[model samples]
Target: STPIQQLLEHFLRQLQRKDPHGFFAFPVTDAIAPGYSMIIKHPMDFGTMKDKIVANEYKSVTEFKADFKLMCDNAMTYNRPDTVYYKLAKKILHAGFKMMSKERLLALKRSMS
Candidate 1:
């Protein structure tokens, strides 16, 4: 497999091991981009995004988050800021950043769990 595919699998494995149920909670509403709707939405969308990662297209996880956003653009269109879904999506987004620590990701998983 390609480096990007390998890395993606690694992260997936880590997330599943950390919290199997919570691993499916990502790509939630208002994450990834406006109207992205669900996790990794479509294969086409993922292919485009994965291509960048394969190319080492980002300088940092923060940069990746900035470019990818990984959250819906219109938070108001979905849950209220205080809603459980909103908070969960926020945590997942934060955890997705490259600079974010694995411990932090685990904590987020625990919080969701």
Candidate 2:
């Protein structure tokens, strides 16, 4: 139990740490991001990911990665390419992808198991 959940918690923290501005920390509401709900069909955020981890909703690393990607993609889609949100999303997404690469995750699984 500790292996899977513990690893996820660690990984989540590492990703969250990259977001210094805290833009991706919570859900993008209509008030702050007007028509965000209308544009983004599916929403994802660090807070929601944390909740999912606590609830054991993620069965594998792939599931967690999907949500992470969705969060970044949502920001990229909602904001213009030249905007801060878009740039930050791209940066975070690249960092996250590198951190969760297949080889890296395989190594982690071997070590964890």
Best by TM-score: 2
Error of 2 at 83 (Å): 0.8
Question: CA lDDT of each candidate?
Answer: 0.46, 0.92
Candidate 1 C-alpha lDDT tens digits along 1-113: 55445555455344334334442334344543554455334322233445566776755444444543443222323557886546654655455554346565577569766
TM-score of each: 0.39, 0.94
Model 1 regions lying over 4 Å from their true place: 15-68, 72-77, 98-113
For 6-109, candidate 2 gives per-residue lDDT tens digits of 88898899999988888989998999988999999999999999999998999998999999999999999999999999999999999989999999988977
For candidate 2, the per-residue lDDT at 42 reads 99
TM-score quality measure for candidate 2: 0.94
Best-matching candidate per lDDT: 2
Report how far off residue 111 is in candidate 1 (Å): 32
Pairs with backbone N, CA or C atoms under 3 Å apart (clashes), candidate 2: none
